[PDB]
């Protein structure tokens with residue numbers, strides 16, 4: 001068998017269940033691939049691991065993938081393009097969640113000054129968005145009381161224990177980590193003003209407005225106006241066309257099966273959307289798949 005490891009994120013985010021379900025589905029297709037998901041810090045770690053030859057595929061944010069491919073915009077990639085990544089599919093929106101304890105004196109992003117904040121994991125996309133958003137509100141990590149980098153499960157535990165005041169997570173709606181925190185702890189979601197971000201859209205062009213419906217998380221009954229990017233499935237350029245083509249048919253050829261993997265896929269995924277506005281080139285095997293499917297002409 002040909003072994004594929006799919007980098008993901010924290011076990012209580014959305015990448016990890018999605019990657020796990022993708023891996024199972026391609027294994028079940030009996031196409032000579034043996035796939036597994038791996039938990040990681042998220043997008044930056046995942047791209048680095050593809051480039052290093054450690055992972056064959058991963059989930060990543062569209063913004064981070066662009067920055068990697070261009071060698072720009074964030075410190076992790078500035079100065080050295082990562083041209084070894086290719087797109088397979090745009091998947092679903094990843095929303096910037098800014099979670100605050102209700103007792104912490106936080107109603108806006110500006111209130112994070114002096115607070116203990118989980119800014120994202122080491123190697124996360126989340127941290128990059130947090131840094132950009134804080135600067136749009138006139139803050140740096142140094143203005144925080146503590147800038148904490150940990151996994152989603154560690155981060156929610158800190159907020160449960162009142163060892164953190166707030167937590168950022170760029171993640172699909174309905175992440176277990178967030179759901180679990182809302183069940184135990186009085187929390188709110190802090191708004192992120194797109195227009196304040198928009199002042200920085202020249203530099204960071206992938207933010208879109210996104211409104212988290214009220215009642216998504218327990219006790220959070222009001223809507224939350226924030227911003228989103230897009231989750232993507234990416235792959236090494238070094239994977240053969242034939243391997244990627246077979247993978248694509250096994251995973252995306254099976255649309256009902258694919259959408260069962262996570263509610264975000266059922267809600268948001270579609271084949272036409274999968275190829276729209278991509279930040280990096282498609283893998284040849286994906287191009288072939290989408291051409292046959294009639295999605296690319």
Ligand SMILES: N[C@@H](CCC(=O)O)C(=O)O
Pocket residue numbers: 008009010013014015016041042043044060061094120123124125126127170171172
């Ligand atoms: N987009 C997040 C991870 C989201 C998830 O694990 O679902 C990141 O790159 O850090």
